[PDB]
Amino acid sequence: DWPVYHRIDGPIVMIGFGSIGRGTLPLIERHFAFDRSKLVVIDPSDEARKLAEARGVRFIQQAVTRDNYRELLVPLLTAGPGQGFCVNLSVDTSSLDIMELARENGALYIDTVVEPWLGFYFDPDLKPEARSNYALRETVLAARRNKPGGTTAVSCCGANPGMVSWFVKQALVNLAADLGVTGEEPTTREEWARLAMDLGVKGIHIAERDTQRASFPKPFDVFVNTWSVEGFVSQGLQPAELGWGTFERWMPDNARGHDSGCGAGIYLLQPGANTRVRSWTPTAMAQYGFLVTHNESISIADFLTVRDAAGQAVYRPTCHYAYHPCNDAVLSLHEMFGSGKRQSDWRILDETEIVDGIDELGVLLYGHGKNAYWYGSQLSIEETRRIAPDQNATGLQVSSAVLAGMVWALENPNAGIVEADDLDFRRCLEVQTPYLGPVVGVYTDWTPLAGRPGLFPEDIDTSDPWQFRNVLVR
Amino acid sequence: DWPVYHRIDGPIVMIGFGSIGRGTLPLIERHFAFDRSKLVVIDPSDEARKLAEARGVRFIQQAVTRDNYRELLVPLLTAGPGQGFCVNLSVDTSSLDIMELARENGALYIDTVVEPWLGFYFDPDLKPEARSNYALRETVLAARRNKPGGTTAVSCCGANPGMVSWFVKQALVNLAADLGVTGEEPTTREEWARLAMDLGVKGIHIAERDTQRASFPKPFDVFVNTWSVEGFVSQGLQPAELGWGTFERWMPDNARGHDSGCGAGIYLLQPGANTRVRSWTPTAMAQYGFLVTHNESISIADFLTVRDAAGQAVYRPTCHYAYHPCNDAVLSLHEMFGSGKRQSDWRILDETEIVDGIDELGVLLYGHGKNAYWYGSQLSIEETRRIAPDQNATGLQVSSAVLAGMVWALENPNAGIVEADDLDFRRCLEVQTPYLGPVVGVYTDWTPLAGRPGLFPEDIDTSDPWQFRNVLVRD
Numbered sequence: 007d008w009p010v011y012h013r014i015d016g017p018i019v020m021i022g023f024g025s026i027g028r029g030t031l032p033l034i035e036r037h038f039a040f041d042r043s044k045l046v047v048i049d050p051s052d053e054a055r056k057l058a059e060a061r062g063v064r065f066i067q068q069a070v071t072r073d074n075y076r077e078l079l080v081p082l083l084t085a086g087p088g089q090g091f092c093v094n095l096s097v098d099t100s101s102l103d104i105m106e107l108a109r110e111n112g113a114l115y116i117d118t119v120v121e122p123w124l125g126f127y128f129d130p131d132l133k134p135e136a137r138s139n140y141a142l143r144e145t146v147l148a149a150r151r152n153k154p155g156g157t158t159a160v161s162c163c164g165a166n167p168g169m170v171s172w173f174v175k176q177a178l179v180n181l182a183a184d185l186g187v188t189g190e191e192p193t194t195r196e197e198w199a200r201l202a203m204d205l206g207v208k209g210i211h212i213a214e215r216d217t218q219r220a221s222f223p224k225p226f227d228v229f230v231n232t233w234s235v236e237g238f239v240s241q242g243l244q245p246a247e248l249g250w251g252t253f254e255r256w257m258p259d260n261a262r263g264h265d266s267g268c269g270a271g272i273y274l275l276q277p278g279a280n281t282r283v284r285s286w287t288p289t290a291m292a293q294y295g296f297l298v299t300h301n302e303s304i305s306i307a308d309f310l311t312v313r314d315a316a317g318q319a320v321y322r323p324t325c326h327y328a329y330h331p332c333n334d335a336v337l338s339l340h341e342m343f344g345s346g347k348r349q350s351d352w353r354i355l356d357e358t359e360i361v362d363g364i365d366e367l368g369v370l371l372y373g374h375g376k377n378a379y380w381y382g383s384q385l386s387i388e389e390t391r392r393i394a395p396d397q398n399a400t401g402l403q404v405s406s407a408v409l410a411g412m413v414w415a416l417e418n419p420n421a422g423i424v425e426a427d428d429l430d431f432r433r434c435l436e437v438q439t440p441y442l443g444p445v446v447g448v449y450t451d452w453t454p455l456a457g458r459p460g461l462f463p464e465d466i467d468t469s470d471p472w473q474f475r476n477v478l479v480r
Numbered sequence: 481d482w483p484v485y486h487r488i489d490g491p492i493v494m495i496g497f498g499s500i501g502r503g504t505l506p507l508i509e510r511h512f513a514f515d516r517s518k519l520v521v522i523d524p525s526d527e528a529r530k531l532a533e534a535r536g537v538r539f540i541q542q543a544v545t546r547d548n549y550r551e552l553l554v555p556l557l558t559a560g561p562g563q564g565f566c567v568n569l570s571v572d573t574s575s576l577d578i579m580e581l582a583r584e585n586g587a588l589y590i591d592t593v594v595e596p597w598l599g600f601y602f603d604p605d606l607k608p609e610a611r612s613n614y615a616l617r618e619t620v621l622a623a624r625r626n627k628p629g630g631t632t633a634v635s636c637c638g639a640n641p642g643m644v645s646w647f648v649k650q651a652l653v654n655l656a657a658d659l660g661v662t663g664e665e666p667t668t669r670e671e672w673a674r675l676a677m678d679l680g681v682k683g684i685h686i687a688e689r690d691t692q693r694a695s696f697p698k699p700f701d702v703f704v705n706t707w708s709v710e711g712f713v714s715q716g717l718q719p720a721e722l723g724w725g726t727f728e729r730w731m732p733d734n735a736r737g738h739d740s741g742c743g744a745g746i747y748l749l750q751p752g753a754n755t756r757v758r759s760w761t762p763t764a765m766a767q768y769g770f771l772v773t774h775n776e777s778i779s780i781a782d783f784l785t786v787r788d789a790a791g792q793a794v795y796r797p798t799c800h801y802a803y804h805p806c807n808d809a810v811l812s813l814h815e816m817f818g819s820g821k822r823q824s825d826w827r828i829l830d831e832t833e834i835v836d837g838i839d840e841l842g843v844l845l846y847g848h849g850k851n852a853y854w855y856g857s858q859l860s861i862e863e864t865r866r867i868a869p870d871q872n873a874t875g876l877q878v879s880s881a882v883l884a885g886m887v888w889a890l891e892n893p894n895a896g897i898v899e900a901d902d903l904d905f906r907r908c909l910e911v912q913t914p915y916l917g918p919v920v921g922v923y924t925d926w927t928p929l930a931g932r933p934g935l936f937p938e939d940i941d942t943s944d945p946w947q948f949r950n951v952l953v954r955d
């Protein structure tokens with residue numbers, strides 16, 4: 007039967023019961039030992055409440071806010087007898103403030119995004135840079151500098167951000183092995199960064215193609231997605247953002263850097279979900295992705311930075327999302343940006359509605375001797391239904407990553423604030439892999455200059471096909 | 481019963497029997513008197529042959545080419561008795577050369593595009609300007625100057641180009657009434673141009689939203705459309721192109737003009753089907769369209785040009801396509817441009833496959849005192865099936881326009897080379913309207929600056945909402 011990894015000796019407080027919470031609950035019940043009454047779900051939605059009642063779990067129908075979060079969460083997380091676990095799978099709540107609360111009270115914490123309190127993503131008084139994921143991530147890095155060590159809190163441990171950091175490590179090890187490079191694999195951050203440098207990895211796309219589709223066609227004036235519509239639209243309206251490689255020799259006129267922080271990012275003064283990049287996955291082959299901002303774009307580039315003695319970066323890979331969502335989501339974006347406003351309604355595709363498809367999600371390492379290598383999951387909806395309830399393929403990649411991060415945090419409970427890049431990738435993938443379907447590594451000779459230039463003048467760099475100059479659709 | 485407008489006494493030579501030929505043949509049989517044996521269909525495909533054989537129509541399985549077109553077509557066009565009609569609904573053939581051949585042999589001619597001989601659209605040695613529809617159209621204008629008058633040949637008389645020119649005239653008449661502009665209805669080009677100027681029409685979108693969809697979802701690595709995939713892709717890869725208004729204050733850095741010709745156009749050094757514009761239709765409300773080059777973008781702007789005594793244009797509207805095709809075609813474009821190459825396969829959706837939807841096709845006149853006015857057809861697939869066989873709603877708007885053009889040509893057979901802008905719009909719409917479903921005019925307060933600027937700095941002109949600077953989507 008299914009492995010039971012650990013006993014949780016305290017309350018399990020799940021904040022949010024949308025597509026991810028719904029997928030994560032059965033894995034928590036499956037894989038951890040605890041008295042049933044220890045677990046409670048918090049979400050303001052009526053739809054969520056009804057589902058939770060049907061699953062027999064405690065449910066508190068309340069929005070967690072800046073005004074109530076201490077009065078609500080401190081008692082729930084300290085109910086006893088021992089260490090609890092805050093599993094934060096929400097929108098509209100501050101990941102930073104909830105994480106700090108959990109740590110102050112000795113509760114473990116995990117989330118899948120650095121989310122702000124409601125009001126931030128569309129605050130008109132905020133400059134674009136202040137709305138960036140780089141800025142949000144810097145709040146977490148500052149919190150870690152202020153309070154090193156202490157109770158483990160795992161930031162951004164879903165599928166992407168999350169699992170894809172483990173895929174980057176596995177891909178680096180595979181690339182070295184395929185080149186005939188043997189020996190002890192890296193154990194420190196500096197060793198990982200040097201491995202990427204040494205192998206000549208110029209950059210990395212988080213290269214995703216979701217082919218799930220429903221039994222009904224996309225409705226007019228309805229945004230359709232396979233996971234959070236609210237969350238996808240919010241990140242899609244944030245600036246396009248990327249980890250910025252030392253090899254890059256060009257950026258657009260509307261690109262900007264940061265005066266402070268880890269140093270690894272740029273952003274563009276335009277929305278990421280209306281920015282296209284040329285990319286590739288095994289099933290899609292050459293495709294457009296959307297350059298939607300994501301925590302891992304910054305965290306992976308930061309993690310893989312090599313500095314000189316003076317502290318200047320001498321190597322860092324480019325890293326960004328290149329997302330091709332499901333076809334109905336592609337149409338939803340065309341509709342939303344074309345109208346200039348959010349649709350009147352939205353819906354997240356349920357497994358009962360999906361006729362076929364996969365969520366092909368991996369990392370595309372490029373610029374090395376073998377040109378490009380994609381490593382990741384090809385999980386299908388059919389396999390998903392066989393192995394986990396209450397979710398589609400997109401959901402299961404995320405919920406299984408939360409499971410893996412929870413196992414890691416319980417196993418390493420005194421590690422302080424950590425990102426997915428800081429965890430034991432082998433252990434996390436050992437836990438996650440039963441839920442990932444085919445996990446494969448594929449080389450390709452494709453580059454962003456394939457077939458170019460065409461019949462119009464193009465500003466390309468033929469000396470270096472993987473330059474962002476050639477990737478960005480301009 | 482259906483009106484039989486005229487007898488056709490000579491050969492009816494249909495070149496091409498794809499989606500539009502299949503929709504047009506039944507209308508020709510319905511609306512003209514003639515012995516069926518006088519019809520001949522020419523198409524290289526086996527698919528077309530079997531369909532033509534099923535209709536008991538004479539078929540020649542040949543590609544018309546620069547090498548064979550004279551030897552092949554002249555005996556067909558001149559078989560008699562009396563005047564033939566060449567109905568050209570093909571791809572890969574020279575509209576100009578075939579039209580000139582028809583005229584020199586006294587046969588009427590109609591087409592729906594200025595198509596070049598196979599090889600042109602992807603010729604790597606062609607300068608971008610030479611790939612433009614402005615350039616192709618100038619070959620037709622030059623032919624007209626060289627041989628004025630004579631046998632009628634109707635260039636670009638489908639739905640768009642074609643019908644939409646008639647919608648522009650009707651829309652101008654309606655705007656004049658609604659804005660209180662008095663005067664007799666224009667009866668000359670110069671008078672139409674002056675009316676557009678007096679009404680303050682800054683520009684015109686050919687504003688289209690196709691909502692047809694099939695019983696199956698879009699297959700991977702298949703381009704899906706409701707009409708010619710080959711044709712749509714070819715025009716989509718031509719430069720983005722537009723008739724250029726005198727009111728415009730800005731053009732992109734990669735815009736270019738023309739040193740010669742009618743003077744009405746610019747083009748952009750990028751493909752039109754990967755160029756977006758902000759536009760609007762009644763059912764879509766605000767939407768993106770693709771800035772795909774079309775003959776009418778140039779022909780309507782040219783027709784509505786006012787010149788001073790020196791010959792300099794003092795007024796001309798902007799005019800261009802703002803096309804939102806069916807959802808499966810939107811996905812097909814994302815796939816094609818994302819991969820950098822044509823899909824391995826394609827299909828045109830048949831009426832038997834389409835579950836619901838309309839082809840909402842009209843003209844959006846903007847900049848006047850009531851902001852913007854859309855006039856056009858909202859034909860549904862359900863209505864299409866009730867009234868005409870072998871086609872979807874896209875096809876029927878086109879085939880019925882060809883029908884209207886044929887009736888006009890038979891009634892005016894010595895008018896020389898003409899575009900849809902030159903035809904009697906009322907007579908043409910009288911013939912076509914039974915096939916157009918709801919034809920409506922709708923005002924809107926929407927403008928391209930609605931909701932802007934938003935969260936990011938935008939390069940907009942806040943002084944004039946309808947400036948191209950505000951319409952063009954700038955990656």
Ligand SMILES: NC(=O)c1ccc[n+]([C@@H]2O[C@H](COP(=O)([O-])OP(=O)(O)OC[C@H]3O[C@@H](n4cnc5c(N)ncnc54)[C@H](O)[C@@H]3O)[C@@H](O)[C@H]2O)c1
Nearest residue numbers: 023024025026051069070096097118164165166167234237
């Ligand atoms: N790292 C990844 O791979 C990844 C993947 C998917 C989702 N996510 C993120 O996970 C989160 C959940 O995604 P989802 O698909 O479940 O979204 P969802 O939109 O389906 O559900 C969000 C849920 O949060 C709720 N909620 C709203 N306000 C709340 C509040 N004040 N307090 C508590 N709950 C509140 C909704 O009622 C709701 O049910 C999103 O933030 C998201 O961006 C991360």
Ligand SMILES: NC(=O)c1ccc[n+]([C@@H]2O[C@H](COP(=O)([O-])OP(=O)(O)OC[C@H]3O[C@@H](n4cnc5c(N)ncnc54)[C@H](O)[C@@H]3O)[C@@H](O)[C@H]2O)c1
Nearest residue numbers: 496497498499500543544570571592638639640641708711
């Ligand atoms: N003005 C408008 O509104 C409008 C609308 C639709 C189509 N069109 C145009 O009409 C034409 C036909 O469109 P469609 O949807 O029927 O296209 P289609 O792709 O369905 O059919 C084209 C047909 O031409 C044929 N053909 C190819 N090479 C030929 C040759 N050398 N000689 C003769 N025939 C040849 C194919 O075998 C074929 O059946 C296209 O050029 C097009 O762009 C205009």
Ligand SMILES: N=C(N)NCCCCN
Nearest residue numbers: 195308309423424427428
């Ligand atoms: N992952 C990084 N960018 N730095 C390492 C952080 C180490 C936290 N203990």
Ligand SMILES: N=C(N)NCCCCN
Nearest residue numbers: 669782783897898901902
């Ligand atoms: N329609 C124009 N642009 N000019 C008028 C041409 C008239 C041809 N008889």
